[PDB]
């Protein structure tokens, strides 16, 4: 039967979506079906901040960040400890934790 109302995706009035490639396996997945995430970390790992503070030439230096947007396919997201599987009543829950 029909598992989902939107069937996998966010295509309502769109016809075509012009897909993207998964960051883990280069699988072509439509952009509405993708499981887009944003990974925003510091330029420096948290165990090196005090290390880098005493080695910096500057009194006040703002640590920059990496802002990288990730697109996963369904197979790679479930395998990589992401959205993997929810119960039928919890499938309809659209709110992030």
């Amino acid at each position: 039967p029909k598992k989902r109302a939107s069937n996998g995706r966010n295509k309502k009035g769109r016809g075509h979506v012009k897909p993207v490639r998964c960051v883990n396996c280069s699988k072509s997945i439509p952009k509405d079906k993708a499981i887009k995430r944003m990974a925003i970390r510091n330029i420096v790992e948290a165990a090196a901040v005090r290390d880098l503070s005493e080695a910096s030439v500057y009194p006040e230096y703002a640590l920059p960040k990496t802002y990288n947007k990730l697109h996963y396919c369904v197979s790679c997201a479930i395998h990589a400890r992401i959205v993997r599987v929810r119960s039928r009543e919890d499938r309809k829950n659209r709110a992030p934790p």
Partner: protein
């Protein structure tokens, strides 16, 4: 993986740093700091002419280092060597850029990105490509959560920005443009001329790149140093 090269030579030790010696970099006078850093070349032999070896180098430096203040922390500046005189080589402006973290911090969703570029030539026949960026902003008292523009506001904003950038360039030779970009005064009348259309936050304009240059005219560069 040392023991992995099957062959090191298809057909079948002198340390170069003793040969190497140091120079120093001089910023133009439209910058609060002249001392940028030091470079290495080989010894000036009679057949390789070390002055020509370091003649066309491009040095990457930050504007916060050039001005001391940390407010212009992103704002990267290209400096191009042109004229060398006894371990005291001089540099001229080659371009300006943003850091990748500052650009990606600005680009957020549920707002509209507006980009404008021009290809206007200055008074010294410098041809520059100047890029601009802006973002629509959520006004105070606003309830709804995205604040998008209406694609004719964008075309009205883009026309306003492109006419401003092409106006401030003709009238500025090069040093007036560098002394206009440093105070970030260009971002001001973009905001003033676009507040009629849309709120438009975050107008730290964008990079500017050089395209073509005229002849040398070494009196101009010694006006920047001397």
């Amino acid at each position: 993986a040392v023991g992995k090269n099957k062959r090191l030579s298809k057909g079948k030790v002198v340390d170069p740093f003793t040969r190497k010696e140091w120079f120093d970099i001089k910023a133009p006078s439209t910058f609060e700091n002249r001392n940028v850093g030091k470079t290495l070349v080989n010894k000036s032999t009679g057949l390789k002419s070390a002055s020509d070896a370091l003649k066309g180098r491009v040095v990457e430096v930050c504007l916060a280092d050039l001005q001391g203040s940390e407010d212009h922390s992103f704002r990267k500046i290209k400096l191009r060597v042109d004229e060398v005189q006894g371990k005291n080589l001089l540099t001229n402006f080659h371009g300006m850029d943003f850091t990748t973290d500052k650009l990606r911090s600005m680009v957020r969703k549920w707002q509209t990105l507006i980009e404008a570029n021009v290809t206007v030539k200055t008074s010294d026949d410098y041809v520059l490509r100047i890029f601009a960026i802006a973002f629509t902003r959520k006004q105070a008292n606003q309830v709804k959560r995205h604040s998008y523009a209406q694609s004719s506001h964008i075309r009205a904003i883009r026309k306003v920005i492109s006419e401003i950038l092409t106006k401030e360039v003709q009238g500025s030779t090069l040093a007036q443009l560098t002394s206009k970009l440093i105070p970030e005064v260009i971002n001001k009348e973009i905001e003033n001329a676009t507040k009629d259309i849309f709120p438009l936050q975050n107008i730290h304009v964008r990079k500017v790149k050089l395209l073509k240059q005229p002849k040398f005219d070494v009196g101009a560069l010694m006006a920047l140093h001397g």
